[PDB]
Amino acid sequence: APVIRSKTSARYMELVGWLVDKGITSEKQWIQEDQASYISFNAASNSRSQIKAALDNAGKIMSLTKTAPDYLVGQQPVEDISSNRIYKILELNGYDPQYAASVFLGWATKKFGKRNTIWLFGPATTGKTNIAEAIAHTVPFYGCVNWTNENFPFNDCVDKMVIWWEEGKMTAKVVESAKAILGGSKVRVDQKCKSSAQIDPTPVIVTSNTNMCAVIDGNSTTFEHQQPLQDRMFKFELTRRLDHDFGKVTKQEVKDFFRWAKDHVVEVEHEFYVKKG
Amino acid sequence: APVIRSKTSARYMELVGWLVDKGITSEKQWIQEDQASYISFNAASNSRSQIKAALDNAGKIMSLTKTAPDYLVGQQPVEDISSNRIYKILELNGYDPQYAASVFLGWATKKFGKRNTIWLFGPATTGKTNIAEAIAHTVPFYGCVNWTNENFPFNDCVDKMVIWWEEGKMTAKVVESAKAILGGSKVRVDQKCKSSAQIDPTPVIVTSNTNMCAVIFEHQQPLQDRMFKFELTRRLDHDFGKVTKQEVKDFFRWAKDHVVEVEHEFYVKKG
Amino acid sequence: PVIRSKTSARYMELVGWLVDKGITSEKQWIQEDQASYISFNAASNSRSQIKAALDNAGKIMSLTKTAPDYLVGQQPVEDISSNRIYKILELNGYDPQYAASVFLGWATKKFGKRNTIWLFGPATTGKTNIAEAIAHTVPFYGCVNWTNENFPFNDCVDKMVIWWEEGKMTAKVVESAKAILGGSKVRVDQKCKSSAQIDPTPVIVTSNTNMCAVIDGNSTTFEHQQPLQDRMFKFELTRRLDHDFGKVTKQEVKDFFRWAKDHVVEVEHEFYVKKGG
Amino acid sequence: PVIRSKTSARYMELVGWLVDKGITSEKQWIQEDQASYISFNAASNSRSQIKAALDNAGKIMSLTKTAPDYLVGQQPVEDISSNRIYKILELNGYDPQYAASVFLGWATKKFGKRNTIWLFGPATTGKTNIAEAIAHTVPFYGCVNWTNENFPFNDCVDKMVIWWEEGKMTAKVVESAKAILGGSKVRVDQKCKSSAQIDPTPVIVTSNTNMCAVIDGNSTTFEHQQPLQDRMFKFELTRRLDHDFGKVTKQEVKDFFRWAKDHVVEVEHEFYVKKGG
Amino acid sequence: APVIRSKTSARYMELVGWLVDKGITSEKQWIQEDQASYISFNAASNSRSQIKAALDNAGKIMSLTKTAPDYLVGQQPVEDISSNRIYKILELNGYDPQYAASVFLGWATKKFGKRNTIWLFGPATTGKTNIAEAIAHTVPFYGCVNWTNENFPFNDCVDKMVIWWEEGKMTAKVVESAKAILGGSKVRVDQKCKSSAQIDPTPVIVTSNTNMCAVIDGNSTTFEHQQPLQDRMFKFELTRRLDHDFGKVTKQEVKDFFRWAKDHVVEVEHEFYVKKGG
Amino acid sequence: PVIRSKTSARYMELVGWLVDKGITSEKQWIQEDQASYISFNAASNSRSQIKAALDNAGKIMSLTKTAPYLVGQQPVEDISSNRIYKILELNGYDPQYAASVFLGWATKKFGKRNTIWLFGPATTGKTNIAEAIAHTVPFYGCVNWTNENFPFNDCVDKMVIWWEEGKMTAKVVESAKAILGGSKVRVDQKCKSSAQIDPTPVIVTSNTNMCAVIDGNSTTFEHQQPLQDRMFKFELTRRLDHDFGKVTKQEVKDFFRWAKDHVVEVEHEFYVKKGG
Amino acid sequence: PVIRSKTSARYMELVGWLVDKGITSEKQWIQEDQASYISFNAASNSRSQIKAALDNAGKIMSLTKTAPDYLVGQQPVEDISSNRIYKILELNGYDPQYAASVFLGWATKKFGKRNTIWLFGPATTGKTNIAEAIAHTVPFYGCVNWTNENFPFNDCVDKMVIWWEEGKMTAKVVESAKAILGGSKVRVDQKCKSSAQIDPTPVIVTSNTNMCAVIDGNSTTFEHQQPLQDRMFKFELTRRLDHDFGKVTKQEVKDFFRWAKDHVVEVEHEFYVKKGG
DNA sequence: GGGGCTCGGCGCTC
DNA sequence: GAGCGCCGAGCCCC
Ligand SMILES: Nc1ncnc2c1ncn2[C@@H]1O[C@H](COP(=O)(O)OP(=O)(O)OP(O)(O)=S)[C@@H](O)[C@H]1O
Ligand SMILES: Nc1ncnc2c1ncn2[C@@H]1O[C@H](COP(=O)(O)OP(=O)(O)OP(O)(O)=S)[C@@H](O)[C@H]1O
Ligand SMILES: [Mg+2]
Ligand SMILES: [Mg+2]
């Protein structure tokens, strides 16, 4: 393994070591942590691209040493779980907190195999986007499926940890790729103006107001892809309209909820409609 | 053949040797095998392009010694088969194990000619992507026909050993091009932001839940004459595990020692 | 004017070596001497020099020989009844002497406006076998890009034989095609090049769907029938070859074309090749 | 990971200066010191440094600075009578040392839910003179486009102060305004952009009308008066200003705060302000 | 603040100062003022971008952050102003040369408050086109009120050191906005394909052969806004016709005129019609 | 602000050269000197230098030079050998009278009579005279009267304008009376903002009466006198020989050079007095 | 002004060489010398000098050299019995010397309005073998592209010879067609370019029908035949050539158009070329 | 759905 | 290395 030993090489190695230690995975965090370093590294033209390269290398080295559970699950219990917004929404909706929390934990770790996405389906103003945002932002680098663009939808989901599909239906053009990335199957997807890369199994969380198991194409809907999708989804149907002035789901709430999940884990039947009784 | 002799050329010849001798083909594998090596080569633009050049050259060098049959057949015997998972998948549906195994083995060596594509077709949760992914990852290089991007579909199938068309449907924009790769025909395909390149014959696995020998029917006969068809129809359980990267080798290697003549046909005969 | 420097000496040695060995693509270059390719890829001027060397060597070989030099053979044929092209053309009916004369004429650019041979027939009859044998008997051969629309006839520039594998005559490229398939000069697009030009070269189409009927969206306009038929001969193959029949090796192509030059006979300018003997 | 060099030192000094002056775009730089702008904008190595420096100044100021930093002046003030707003306070009775103390607590967010200001009085009463000066002072300032019902608070994101000129309250934005007017974190919809969170930003309002009255079509309701009376102060500037008093210069703003920080007095948490008897 | 000091920096500073001073907003004027400098700076690839950057900076620095009189009052004093055509144009129409010139200076300096306009009125070929052009072209940046375009009549009136309302015909749709501008009051105007911009107090000059006090609204004419309008403009009615060989006025002459004004100012009033020397 | 250096000095020399010899496109450069162009195109540095030199020279000659290049530098001892002289002499026009008028037309000396209308049948030297003189000055325009929308599109910043086979039309009569009147007038340009045309002497070769405004199937002479107050008409009736040849750029310069040395008074008449 | 160094001298030598041997594309460069071309691709400087050299040589030729300057070869001609054009002409009824003289006049622009020569006759008569021989014997040439009705002559600008290979004449460009065929300047519209003037250039036409036919929508009118026949010296190929007749080499064309000048004969301006000595 | 529209990341050339 | 520039792949509007 040749190891370049120039001055630029030494500076770059030190920078990426510091970045991987301090968990910095974006400029914003850098400028929040050490202002002098960033201002200095923007003071030329060699280092301007070196910044982007360093951030990408830090992202790669973190993604290959820490998976989703490392960040999500917390390190201390809560000792009183009712203020958690997540628990209150999943309780008032009807599901019991134990089984609902076991399913979430078994979805961060991929213990469930093909079922690699949790589908939140509820009328407007129920919590879908809130929980999705919390679980998506609690990780270093998440991914959003650009459902508007139909020729390169999963373009930012290369080398990520948690994918989040915010809205939209399952068009007849993205069903073929969705069945691959939702199913946690290693494939090689198309990259804009570049060659293909590999998408390792990444858990997904889809929030929508309209059904995804019946593909929709313009003025016609299809049902041949209803079993293959329904066998790779959990379907949390959240109905009760969330009261006004309900606190933004704060990262610490997500960490504590998942920690309580790991504390009271209970086995969950491997089915589509998550048991609610 | 002028051999450039300098410092940079020697270092590059040292990097490509290390890459080939360690089976490294992608950056991720480079990081896993050695971290300081990769973190160094992103420093300057020279090395940043040298990384891509070295990976491509290592890929080419590995291919010009080997082929698919040299990776998919293990170096040790089986001594027990009923525990295997490809065997179980093929036995549940009724297919005689060794007949279909001979079909697979011949499909790997290109012994059948124009018919070098296995089409696994069946209802949901039957065991198609399992076998397909096991076979595709047992080999170092594998392509995947792009579903979207109907202008450069077969861009990732230029110098690969085993193609894997996942959840594919035959649209009229790919039929005329899929009539070349699925038949091992030596043709020059279009690449992106690069000059056209040549595709040597390559086996192809197709796993589709919908009929794939009909364009959406004038191309039914020419398409169903370059693919076998294994109609898997038994719903599996969730305890049934993944086809490990080592079970494929055991299956194909148990095949090489019990090969049987396979009747050239579109519908692989049950029983 | 001969630029005499060290780099010019290296380049001249490289091009002379390539022409003496017969390399026309990078893959063969590696396959002959790996050290050469790896070294000439190391540096930053590397890629430019490799691309220029390949293009220049191909140009030299193309100017120093033509299609008949490669296709025709220097040794005679003891008995042609074994060669598979003869059997393909005899099962269907065509008298092999007449068809051999037609093939030899098309190779040597001698029939004027009918500069192409069209093979058409139901599935598994023998089209692609003959086409690929002929195409690979010549060191250089082009192929039309089926899907790409912004650069359709790329890779057909300065080749010896053009091989349209399974093409369909789309309305986008009907004019440029009506000109390339006619032994004339056309203005074609290219990648990162300034509107290069196509020399008049033989073309061998092997589509199993009608090639003289243009398709417009979901419509088929027969307007362009006469312009296309007046510049192509047609071999209507019907018989169904069986497996374990083998592919036409290059030696067979050379032997057949040689057996033509020694037995040539006249042929009328007719779209439908005279079906009999 | 600090780049020590000449260009690095110059860039650090420049961006520190920029964040010190709150300069964001060039035009402001020109107005502050033209010679620096020129001297930088000559060579090709500097014409990119300027853009990068403006971007870095913007980011540093946004992510690590608040309004009271750019408002509170530096040099101590010996006289405040000459202060123009002071006169606009004394002339209209409002005790300067008290009425001035009102803003500072609003500047430093010391009044929590009462994190907004409303200047009251007829036209030609310096309201927009006291707003614009206390609306342009901060580096990034937002203006409430109450006329645009869809996106009234579009420009209030990533700011340090929010301007409301001739503000009129409508029932459609009353719920949105109360969150903004109360200094509470809230998310607003941006045109052609995702919803963004408006962090507590001391807002300023100028309207000769009554901000406690909600206008809904042809009906006006006071149901949100007290809710709107608990979120902001109110100064009635009856005395019209002379035609020669002019505007309020930035210096006349800052010096007032530097004087309003050295003469602090206890302020009340009431809706209205008290006038010096 | 930071200032870079290098060999290139000194030359660039000199160039931008020279540009802001001479009034060289664009290249072509650079050619017309010193061809040697342009033919020189165009030589290499390090100067062929220096030119464009210098022009951008100069246009910006001048158009903003500087006052219009700064290129209407010259430097070298004027001994004999009678030779100046304007002195002849005003003298020809019985306009006391010293009074109007004093009125001219005040209008440029905004000293005449809301009366921020000069309306050269009368038939054609009476100096109205000559003066306006000579004065409008004099300043670095100027615009022409596009009254014909109702949507954005004042699109090109932003950051214009002088506004020339050529053959103006004020309409009912622009009367309100015109009064604020004609009054020199800060007003926001809509720009085509751009956000609304504010027009700081900016002088005007109106040349027309129709009465501006009349509001043209379709087939009806109303003088309702007559009094406010006449409180925002002066009236230098020019009736005498000029000779065919009179010729155009030069910025050299215009400079002299407005320079003579500063040396021959006199007390002035704020009525609507300029008094003619009896 | 003067940048001085070897490159700057050579560039200034080249641009003085180009502005002196009236060069505005590469083709003309190869014609006047192929060796210079071949030499310059060698290095990758000088390509941009050539492009900049050509554009800058064109702009300079546009904005700081006048049309009377028509006057040569060296004196003309003999002018009898000039085709233009022979043409004018052959057409009953006194060489010192029509040359003097010609000169006053180049210098705009006539105020309003800004154009020289060449009249007569084909092959009488009209087109040659216009094509010869017009190709003399660096920049010149062609009146595209066939294009009603933008007939004077190519008449902006032109040292000389040509109206080849012109035909007055009602739509363009007002604009044409403005141009031929040597008066500044703004014209509409295709895909460009309206531009002003400064006074530019004009030369016309036609066989139709320009004083006859054409409007569909009707012809009106209402604009006769105003147009007749804007032209210096010439009637070239004699037919030229086949081997007469074109007028060389050296001849046109020689002709006007003789005129400058033999200036005589001219009368602003709609008909140039022939030599009795 | 003239730059002088070693680089300038080398480029001057190269451009002189190209203009002497009449080169306008790489292929010809390799044909006339190989070590020259291979040398100039080594470095990037040479690979950029090649394009400029070809452009400048092409220009200088199109400006200062005319059609006869290359059609009439530079070396003497001894035997004129063998030349393929000579044999073809003697195989129809034309005196070879007289036909050579008429072609020469068509080259040196001698017959005035009759500035075109027309190759008429049935298929397989060798129209291509002639036109493509002459048209290849001048540095540049163009092909009348009637498929582009907007700019049929867009490829016939600054050409020393023009090839009317195929396509009929449209009514919309009859005047321009007469101008081109009549050796008269004419401004033609160019695609994506300003109108360009086509100087008097000889034209060569290859037709199996009457090109005088003029298409006006659905109407084909011969009213323009007489104006055209006064503008064209026509040749009417009598019968079919032998397919083994060979190809008229460039050297054969040079020999023909050199022996023509050495033995010019008087011509008569009839529409047809006299069929005798 | 078929035309043009600029745009982005890259190469390549200086 | 700067920068420069181009260009194809890609994108959007009518
Ligand atoms: N990552 C995994 N972990 C555990 N089991 C897995 C995993 N991936 C697949 N399986 C098993 O694979 C079995 C069948 O899955 P698949 O092979 O994907 O079926 P399939 O035929 O491909 O379904 P489709 O809809 O046709 S793609 C399931 O019963 C799972 O137990
Ligand atoms: N930043 C925030 N501050 C305060 N409340 C918030 C914030 N973000 C979300 N909420 C609350 O989140 C609750 C539920 O919002 P959502 O989950 O977005 O409802 P939703 O309709 O399921 O989302 P959609 O349909 O995907 S837009 C609302 O009642 C808000 O009060
Ligand atoms: Mg699958
Ligand atoms: Mg085929």
Write the layout of secondary structure elements.
The structure is a homoheptamer.
Chain A: H1 7-22, H2 27-33, H3 35-41, H4 46-63, H5 68-72, H6 85-92, H7 97-108, E1 117-121, H8 128-137, E2 143-144, E3 163-165, H9 175-181, E4 187-189, E5 197-199, E6 204-208, E7 216-217, E8 220-221, H10 226-230, E9 234-236, H11 251-263
Helix pairs in contact in A: 1-4, 2-3, 7-11
One phosphothiophosphoric acid-adenylate ester (AGS) sits between chains B (124-130, 209, 236-238, 240-242) and A (113-114, 184, 228).
Chain A binds a DNA duplex (14 and 14 nucleotides) through residues 45-46, 149, 151-152, 192-194.
What features would you describe in this structure?
Seven copies of one chain form a homoheptamer. Chain A is of the alpha/beta class. Chain A folds into two domains: 7-63, Arc Repressor Mutant, subunit A (Orthogonal Bundle); 68-263, Rossmann fold. In chain A, 39% of the residues lie in helices and 10% in strands. Chain A is built from eleven helices and nine strands. The first copy, chain A, has helices at residues 7-22, 27-33, 35-41, 46-63, 68-72, 85-92, 97-108, 128-137, 175-181, 226-230, 251-263; strands at residues 117-121, 143-144, 163-165, 187-189, 197-199, 204-208, 216-217, 220-221, 234-236. Chain A has a five-stranded parallel sheet, covered by helices on one side. In chain A, strands 4-5 form a two-stranded antiparallel sheet. Chain A has a two-stranded antiparallel sheet with strand order 7-8. In chain A, a hairpin with a 2-residue loop joins strand 7 and strand 8 (220-221). In chain A, helix 7 (97-108) crosses helix 11 (251-263). The longest helix of chain A is centred in the N-terminal third of the chain and has 18 residues, at 46-63. At the A-B interface, helix 1, helix 4, helix 9 and strand 4 of A face helix 1, helix 2, helix 3, helix 4 and helix 8 of B. The complex binds phosphothiophosphoric acid-adenylate ester (2 copies) and magnesium ion (2 copies). One magnesium ion binds at residues 128-129, 166-167, 207 of chain B. The first copy, chain A, binds a DNA duplex (14 and 14 nucleotides) through residues 45-46, 149, 151-152, 192-194. Chain A: Residues 96-251 form the SF3 helicase domain. Chain A: One of its GO terms (biological process) is symbiont-mediated perturbation of host cell cycle G1/S transition checkpoint. Chain A: GO terms for molecular function: ATP binding; ATP hydrolysis activity; DNA binding; endonuclease activity; metal ion binding. Chain A: It comes from Adeno-associated virus 2 (isolate Srivastava/1982). Chain A: ATP binds at residues 122-129.
